[PDB]
Amino acid sequence: SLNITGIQSDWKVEKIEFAKLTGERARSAGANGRIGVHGKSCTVDIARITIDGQTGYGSSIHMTPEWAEDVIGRRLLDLFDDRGRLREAYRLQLEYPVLDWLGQRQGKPVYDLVSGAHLETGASLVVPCYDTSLYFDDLHLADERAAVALMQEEAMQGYAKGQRHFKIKVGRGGRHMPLWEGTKRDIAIVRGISEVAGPAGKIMIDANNAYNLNLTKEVLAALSDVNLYWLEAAFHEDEALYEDLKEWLGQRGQNVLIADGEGLASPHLIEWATRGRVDVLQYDIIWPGFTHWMELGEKLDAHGLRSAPHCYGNAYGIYASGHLSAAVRNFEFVEYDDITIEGMDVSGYRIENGEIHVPATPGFGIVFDDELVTYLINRSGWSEGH
Numbered sequence: 001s002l003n004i005t006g007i008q009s010d011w012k013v014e015k016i017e018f019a020k021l022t023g024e025r026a027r028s029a030g031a032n033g034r035i036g037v038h039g040k041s042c043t044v045d046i047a048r049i050t051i052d053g054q055t056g057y058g059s060s061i062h063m064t065p066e067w068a069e070d071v072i073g074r075r076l077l078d079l080f081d082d083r084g085r086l087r088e089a090y091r092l093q094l095e096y097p098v099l100d101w102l103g104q105r106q107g108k109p110v111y112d113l114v115s116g117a118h119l120e121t122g123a124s125l126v127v128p129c130y131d132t133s134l135y136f137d138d139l140h141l142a143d144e145r146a147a148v149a150l151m152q153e154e155a156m157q158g159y160a161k162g163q164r165h166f167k168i169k170v171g172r173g174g175r176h177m178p179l180w181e182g183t184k185r186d187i188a189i190v191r192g193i194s195e196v197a198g199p200a201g202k203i204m205i206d207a208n209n210a211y212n213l214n215l216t217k218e219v220l221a222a223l224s225d226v227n228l229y230w231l232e233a234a235f236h237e238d239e240a241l242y243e244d245l246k247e248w249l250g251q252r253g254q255n256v257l258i259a260d261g262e263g264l265a266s267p268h269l270i271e272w273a274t275r276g277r278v279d280v281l282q283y284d285i286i287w288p289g290f291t292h293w294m295e296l297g298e299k300l301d302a303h304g305l306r307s308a309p310h311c312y313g314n315a316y317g318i319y320a321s322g323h324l325s326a327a328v329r330n331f332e333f334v335e336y337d338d339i340t341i342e343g344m345d346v347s348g349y350r351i352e353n354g355e356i357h358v359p360a361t362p363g364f365g366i367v368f369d370d371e372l373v374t375y376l377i378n379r380s381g382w383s384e385g386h
């Protein structure tokens, strides 16, 4: 985990500032199984923390000025418990700015701070990613073949920018199209993208809970000849239904992993996973967060389970996920959305051959525009301390 031996006890939180950054994704995202068009506009809530005269930047949620006021003057060491873990009370609000800060101060990327590695460092961090942007962008098209063509073109847009693996939204028949037609269209689209991605491209499908078990089996059977890497959120997680699905997949010799964990998850999901009903856990990279994921990842690794942190709606989480991978053995993929946030320079990262290359620069390797953030803090955000 985190090594905090070189943190001096005199280093205190001097200032906390907050602002909302805005940008856009490269291509507008349509509906998914459960809700309507997501659009192009993106935001990231950011805090800038100052400790011992140095700044760190990162995602911050659930923080008010009044909360922050109470943290000004506290010693950085006191934010950690006896184990070198950031205390629960500070995680959502400050883990990212604090981790970035530690990286800036020590001149190390976060991945080196959290790997717990013993062997000499220096090797570049290269992490598998997948293109998560394949929404229901075809709904304005009545013709199934036209729809497949459009979705193939979207996959090819990602492919030209280095993407090799793709997560395809399915569930069109749950809400937005008639049940049977939408399910037929899901299948055709998945086939179409498979053809684009080729033999080494991993394909995932995400129903946003719009299926039931029999719809799921109908789709999986139809896609027998297609290699599917995982099935995500087929329906709200249920141990009995997944036990059934797993047995069914086994009898068929169909190798598809079951992935779940986003949103308001069952409190028993991990238990179900340890019993073999779910293979890949997808708690979000912002909530419950990075520190939580370090601990969770250790537990999942211990059970031979896989980690694939959810990230959507927050560009910052992409880069966080990349660093988290160094602390988790069975880390699957960074969930990638192509986003440009104003004031948030992520050019140190690049995508090539289905992997994100994480830079070895300090902290999270993201360079914020200090002056723009200051403007946003003052206009619409807030500041505590000095």
Ligand SMILES: [Mg+2]
Residues within 6 Å of the ligand: 233, 235, 236, 237, 260, 261, 262, 265
């Ligand atoms: Mg779920």
